[PDB]
Amino acid sequence: MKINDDIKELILEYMSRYFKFENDFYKLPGIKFTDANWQKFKNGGTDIEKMGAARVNAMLDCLFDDFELAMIGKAQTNYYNDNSLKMNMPFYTYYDMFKKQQLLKWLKNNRDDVIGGTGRMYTASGNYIANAYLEVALESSSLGSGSYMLQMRFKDYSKGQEPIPSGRQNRLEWIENNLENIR
Amino acid sequence: MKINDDIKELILEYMSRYFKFENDFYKLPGIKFTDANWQKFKNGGTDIEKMGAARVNAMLDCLFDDFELAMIGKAQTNYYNDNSLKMNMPFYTYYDMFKKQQLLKWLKNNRDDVIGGTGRMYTASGNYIANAYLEVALESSSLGSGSYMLQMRFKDYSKGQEPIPSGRQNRLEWIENNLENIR
């Protein structure tokens, strides 16, 4: 993993997907931006590399599952080693493609193990954004209490917005049918 | 994951396993400490939570594979939610136990997919520590160019120090026979 402007961009991009109002994210505990300092952060005023470690990792911990944080790092290695990747696309876009390919790998080699659900996002105001993202996990990677070693998050970007159905097979079929609609 | 004193302790613990001389680690490019400031940090004089994000994550990136960084986060969730764990042991020790259990899981359910090798460690002076750690990966998690999505590191602590043999089935047998000697 490497903390740079590519991570700042990834944070701002993922913040905009999961939160309707920015204040629900930047005023969260451990993040706590003042309205003025947040605007400074977004506009390129404060360097992420010199920012407090706990603050930067609280932003990442909120927007990403710990397995996704692993994928971010692995994608970074691939991204900085290939000039064709940097030439054609920004980092956050390559990461999404890297993540999608991991899902396709799970769907090909671990299909009977693929489980899905809906994730909730905690806001600064104390409330929850119900159905903030789709969660995909490998059931056997179970850690107890709804925790999984191998877990990913996707946002449904379809125009139609097919409602995610209940049931193991119904959800597996929904994922396989919405592969081009999720990011 | 969460940046706190448990992560500082984990960094100092893993630094001592992979490096013979501390200067080979703290004077590394992304880390860049001074002989005096490194001592200040070691004996609680410097707060890791307020330290530069790129600096803290360069220490973590050096000592851990990106998949291990995911395990650190997952272990943190388990650790901070179980009073029994917090009562009996520090976090770095629980992490090692968490990591060992992931290996046992791979050895039980993915044995034909377990591959092993030796890892090199880069020092501040420009040299390499040859057999710094044992690397264990799941071959099917191959990202290409010697990169694996699921990869872990162990240090052999046997009094005997059985030499890690060449060969897929021999290395597998070595791991299964040194399960109590590796950390």
Author numbering:
A (entry chain A), B (entry chain B): 1 to 183
Excerpt from the paper describing this PDB structure:
This new Acr, which bears no similarity to any Acr characterized to date, was named AcrIIA6. AcrIIA6s did not impede SpCas9, while AcrIIA2 and AcrIIA4 exhibited only a partial inhibition.
Gel filtration profiles also indicated that AcrIIA6 is a dimer in solution. Each monomer consists of eight α-helices and four β-strands forming a β-sheet, with the sequence topology α1α2α3α4α5α6α7β1β2β3β4α8. The superimposition of the AcrIIA6 HTH dimer onto the C.Esp1396I-dsDNA complex brings the AcrIIA6 helix 3 into contact with the two major grooves of the dsDNA. Helix 3 exhibits strong electropositivity, a feature observed in dsDNA binding helices, including the one from C.Esp1396I. We mapped the sequence conservation among the 48 unique AcrIIA6 alleles to the structure obtained.
